[PDB]
C-alpha cells in the first residue's frame, strides 16, 4: 500500500530487521558451527543455531545504513580564496579579482573516503555554497559574487571582466551579502553509466599517459569572481563548497583507505621525502 | 496522455531518438552510398545501409538541442555605470546621478552570436538585474535604484530629478540594497510578427539612410538613477542586465559568425585602421 | 532547489554487477582480524595470524581480544571501519577461525566469550563458564562462534568506553597440538569477524579512524 509505504518512511521503519526465534539444545550430525571459509562464502550460522534463545521481537531497522543515508549528506568538497584589492590594476587578476577550481571529490578526505568505498557510483548532486568575507579595513562595502560553472571544453576566465563572465550558455549563480546560501542541482553527468572512483587504465600507451581516475574526470570547473569593482577597503573572501549526493546508486564495495591520502586522483600513499613511513590505525598491543 | 507528457518532460525524454536496426550484407543494384549532393539535398544514407550492425536500443533524447533549450538561458546583454558624487551640483548629471542604455542584444558577443544563428526570432523575455556598488569611501550609506523602461517615442531623462522619473505610464522597478535581484517580463514586442536579426534594407532612398537591423530595432531604452540624494561617501555603481528568452520560435537558420564583431547592428567585420586583417578559427596544418 | 542544467537527460543506466543497497551487506562479509598486533608484526601480513604450538603444559592461552567492534584490533576490520561511522550498534556478531596447519595435524581449541564486568578470564576454567565453543579441527577447517546480543540496553556505543564494553574473547587449548613425525610442530590460525542477521548500526558520525592535515 502506497500510504503504508509513506507511513513506514515517516517512522524510519522501511528496512525491517528479523526477529529471534526461540530455540532449545540440539544433538545432531548437523554442525552449523563448522564450515569452510575457504569457499569464499561467509558462514551462515545464526545465534539460533548455537545458543539456546528466548523469543525476541526486533524493532530495529536498517534505514540509516542505506546508501542513500550514508552518502546523501552534505559535506565540504572545496575551498576557494580571493584577496581583493583597492588597486584597480592589481584587481581584475586571478587570485585577487577571481579564482577558479577544478571540480572533484578528491580534495577533502572525509568525503573522498566515504565515496571510495565503492568502485562505481551514480548520483545527482546538490551544491551549496557558503561564503565568508573578512574585511581587512573599516568596512565591507558591497559584496556581490558570481559563481560560474564551466563545462569541460568551455573557455575559462583569465580576467575578472572577461567576456566569458557574460554567461551566455554557462550556468551562473549570483550572491549578495545577506542572501541565503546559494543552492543548485547538477544531474548525474558523465559519458559512462557511472562515475569511476578508481580507474585501472591509461589515456594512451606512451610514458607520459595519465593513469588514475583523472582520465575519467569530466566534472568541469567552477569560476568565482567579485562582481563589484575595486573598493577602498580590501577584503579576504573564502567560499566553501558543499556537496550532497541524491538518488544514489553504487557498485562493487572496496576496502576503506587505511593510510593518509597524499595526492588528488591518486592512490599513492607514500609520505614525502624525509617524512616517516605512513602509518595505519592498527595499534601495537 | 497529458500526464505521460508531464512524466516525459520531467525525465527529459520527450524528443526521443530512433533505434538502430540490425542488418546484414547486401548485394544489389541499389547504391545508398552514391548520390548527387548537387541537388541541394543531404544524402539520406544511414549506418544501417552501409555497415552490418547489431540491434541497439537508443536511450538518447534531443531535448537539450531544442530551440527553447538553446536560447532560453540567461546571459548578460548590458552594463550600465554610474559614478556618484557628494557634490550636489555634479550629482544629478548623466553619468553621475543617472545613466541610460538603448536596448539591444547586439552589445554582448555570446548572446549576439547565438541569436544570429536565425534570421527571424519571436520570444518573450525576462530581464534580470544584477547590481553592484563599490564604495569609494568608508560607507555605502543608503542605496536605492530606479530602473525605468522608456518605450520608443517616450521622453528620456536629462536630470536625475526630472519629471520623467515620476513613472506615470513608464514601467519602473525599484531596488534597495539587500533586495533579491529584480526580475520582470517583457512580452514579445514589435510591429512585425518576429524580430529581425538581419535586415537587408533601408530607412529611405537617400545616402544618409540607415541600412542594418537598426532600422527595425523598436526595443526602447532603459534609464537608471540613484533614487537617493547626494551622500558623503561616493560610490561606483554597476548594473548588469541579463536576458532570457521564453516561448521561443525561430526561422531560417544562418551560418554562425566566423569573425569578431566590430559594431552594434552591423555585419562589418573589418578591423580598425592599423589593425591586422580579421582572423577566423580555421587553423593552418 | 533548481537544476543548473535544464533539459539535460542523464546518461542511460546499464546493468553493473555488485550493486550495494545498504552497508550491512558489507558487514556480513567475513573479514580478517589483525590479532597479532606486535611492533614486529603491525607492518606486515603476519599481523593476521595467530601461532599454535605443541604445549608442555595444559590449558594455556592462545589469544585474547576485546569484542567492542570499533576498538582495537576490530576497529580496522570492515565492520569496525563501517561501525566507526555510526554511534550506536546492536545485534549479535560472528567470529570465525581458520586452521592453517597440516592435514595431518590434530587440535582441539576452546573459544570463549566473557560478558563484561568481570574482566579477562585468568584460566580456561573461568573461560568455560561463559559462552563457548569447543572446536574439533578436522576435514573442515573453519569454526564459527556466535556472540549473542546480551545487553542491558538495545544499543551499545561504538565508542571504546569501558562502561558499555561488550567484554572479551579468549582462546585456550582444549587438548593440545599433536603431530606425527615429518609434520611441523607449529601452525597458524586466522581469525575473521562478520555480522549476524540481527546486526544494526545507528546515528551516523564522522569516523575517528582517518585524518587530514593538508
Amino acid at each position: 500500500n502506497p500510504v503504508e509505504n509513506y507511513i513506514d518512511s515517516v517512522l524510519n521503519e522501511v528496512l525491517v530487521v528479523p526477529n529471534i526465534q526461540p530455540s532449545t539444545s540440539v544433538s545432531s550430525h548437523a554442525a552449523p558451527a563448522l564450515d569452510a571459509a575457504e569457499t569464499g562464502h561467509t558462514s551462515s550460522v545464526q545465534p539460533e543455531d548455537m545458543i539456546e534463545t528466548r523469543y525476541v521481537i526486533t524493532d530495529q531497522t536498517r534505514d540509516e545504513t542505506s546508501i542513500e543515508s550514508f552518502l546523501g549528506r552534505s559535506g565540504c568538497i572545496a575551498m576557494i580564496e580571493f584577496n581583493t584589492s583597492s588597486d584597480k590594476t592589481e584587481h581584475d587578476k586571478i587570485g585577487k579579482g577571481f579564482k577558479t577550481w577544478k571540480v572533484s571529490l578528491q580534495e577533502m578526505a572525509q568525503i573522498r573516503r566515504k565515496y571510495e568505498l565503492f568502485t562505481y557510483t551514480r548520483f545527482d548532486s546538490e551544491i551549496t555554497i557558503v561564503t565568508a568575507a573578512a574585511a581587512q579595513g573599516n568596512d565591507s562595502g558591497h559584496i556581490v559574487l558570481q559563481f560560474m560553472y564551466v563545462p569541460p571544453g568551455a573557455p575559462v576566465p583569465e580576467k575578472r571582466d572577461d567576456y566569458t563572465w557574460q554567461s551566455g550558455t554557462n550556468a551562473s549563480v549570483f550572491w549578495q551579502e545577506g542572501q541565503p546560501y546559494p543552492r543548485f542541482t547538477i544531474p548525474f553527468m558523465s559519458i559512462a553509466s557511472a562515475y569511476y572512483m578508481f580507474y585501472d587504465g591509461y589515456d594512451g600507451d606512451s610514458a607520459a599517459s595519465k593513469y588514475g581516475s583523472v582520465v575519467t574526470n569530466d566534472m568541469g570547473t567552477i569560476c568565482v569572481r567579485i562582481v563589484t569593482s575595486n573598493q577602498k577597503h580590501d577584503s579576504n573572501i573564502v567560499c566553501r563548497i558543499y556537496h550532497k549526493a541524491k538518488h544514489i546508486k553504487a557498485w562493487c564495495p572496496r576496502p576503506p583507505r587505511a593510510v593518509a591520502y597524499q595526492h588528488t586522483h591518486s592512490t599513492n600513499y607514500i609520505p614525502s621525502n624525509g617524512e616517516a613511513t605512513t602509518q595505519i590505525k592498527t595499534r601495537p598491543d | 496522455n497529458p500526464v505521460e507528457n508531464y512524466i516525459d518532460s520531467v525525465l527529459n525524454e520527450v524528443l526521443v531518438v530512433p533505434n538502430i536496426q540490425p542488418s546484414t550484407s547486401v548485394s544489389s543494384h541499389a547504391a545508398p552510398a552514391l548520390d548527387a549532393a548537387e541537388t541541394g539535398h543531404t544524402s539520406s544514407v544511414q549506418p544501417e545501409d552501409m555497415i552490418e550492425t547489431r540491434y541497439v536500443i537508443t536511450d538518447q533524447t534531443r531535448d537539450e538541442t531544442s530551440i527553447e533549450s538553446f536560447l532560453g538561458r540567461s546571459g548578460c546583454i548590458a552594463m550600465i555605470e554610474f559614478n556618484t558624487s557628494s557634490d550636489k551640483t555634479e550629482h544629478d548629471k548623466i553619468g553621475k546621478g543617472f545613466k541610460t542604455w538603448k536596448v539591444s542584444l547586439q552589445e554582448m558577443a555570446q548572446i549576439r552570436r547565438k541569436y544570429e544563428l536565425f534570421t527571424y526570432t519571436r520570444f518573450d523575455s525576462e530581464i534580470t538585474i544584477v547590481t553592484a556598488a563599490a564604495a569609494q569611501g568608508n560607507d555605502s550609506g543608503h542605496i536605492v535604484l530606479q530602473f525605468m523602461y522608456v518605450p520608443p517615442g517616450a521622453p528620456v531623462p536629462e536630470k536625475r530629478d526630472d519629471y520623467t522619473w515620476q513613472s506615470g505610464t513608464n514601467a519602473s522597478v525599484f531596488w534597495q540594497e539587500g533586495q533579491p535581484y529584480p526580475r520582470f517580463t517583457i512580452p514579445f514586442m514589435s510591429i512585425a510578427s518576429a524580430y529581425y536579426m538581419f535586415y537587408d534594407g533601408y530607412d529611405g532612398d537617400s545616402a544618409a539612410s540607415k541600412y542594418g537591423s537598426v532600422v527595425t530595432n523598436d526595443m526602447g531604452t532603459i534609464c537608471v538613477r540613484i533614487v537617493t540624494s547626494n551622500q558623503k561617501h561616493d560610490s561606483n555603481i554597476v548594473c548588469r542586465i541579463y536576458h532570457k528568452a521564453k516561448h521561443i520560435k525561430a526561422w531560417c537558420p544562418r551560418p554562425p559568425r566566423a569573425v569578431a564583431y566590430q559594431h552594434t547592428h552591423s555585419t562589418n567585420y573589418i578591423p580598425s585602421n592599423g589593425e591586422a586583417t580579421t582572423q577566423i578559427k580555421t587553423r593552418p596544418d | 532547489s533548481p537544476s543548473a542544467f535544464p533539459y539535460f537527460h542523464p546518461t542511460k543506466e546499464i546493468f553493473i554487477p555488485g550493486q550495494v543497497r545498504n552497508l550491512i551487506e558489507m558487514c556480513q562479509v567475513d573479514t580478517l582480524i589483525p590479532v597479532n598486533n606486535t611492533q614486529e608484526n603491525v607492518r606486515s601480513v603476519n599481523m593476521y595470524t595467530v601461532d599454535l604450538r605443541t604445549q608442555v603444559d595444559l590449558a594455556k592461552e592462545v589469544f585474547s581480544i576485546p569484542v567492542d567492534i570499533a576498538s582495537q584490533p576490530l576497529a580496522t576490520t570492515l565492520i569496525g571501519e563501517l561501525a566507526s561511522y555510526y554511534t550506536h550498534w546492536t545485534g549479535s556478531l560472528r567470529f570465525s577461525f581458520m586452521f592453517c596447519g597440516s592435514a595431518s595435524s590434530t587440535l582441539k581449541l576452546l573459544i570463549a566469550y566473557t560478558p563484561p564486568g568481570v574482566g579477562k578470564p585468568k584460566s580456561r576454567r573461568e573461560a568455560m563458564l561463559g559462552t563457548h565453543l569447543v572446536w574439533d579441527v578436522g576435514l573442515q577447517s573453519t569454526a564459527s562462534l556466535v556472540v549473542p546480543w546480551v545487553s542491558a540496553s538495545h544499543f551499545r556505543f561504538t565508542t571504546p568506553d569501558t562502561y558499555s564494553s561488550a567484554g572479551y574473547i579468549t582462546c585456550w587449548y582444549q587438548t593440545n597440538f599433536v603431530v606425527p613425525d615429518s609434520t611441523p610442530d607449529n601452525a597458524k590460525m586466522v581469525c575473521m569477524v562478520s555480522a549476524c542477521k540481527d546486526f544494526c548500526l545507528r546515528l551516523a558520525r564522522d569516523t575517528n579512524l582517518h585524518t587530514q592535515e593538508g
Binding site: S9, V14, G72, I186 | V10, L11 | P2, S3
Partner: peptide
Amino acid sequence: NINYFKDAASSGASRLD
C-alpha cells in the same frame, strides 16, 4: 508527492526499497 521543478534531478531524496 509534490514536485516544484520540471527536472527530475531536482526532486528530493529517494525512497528506500
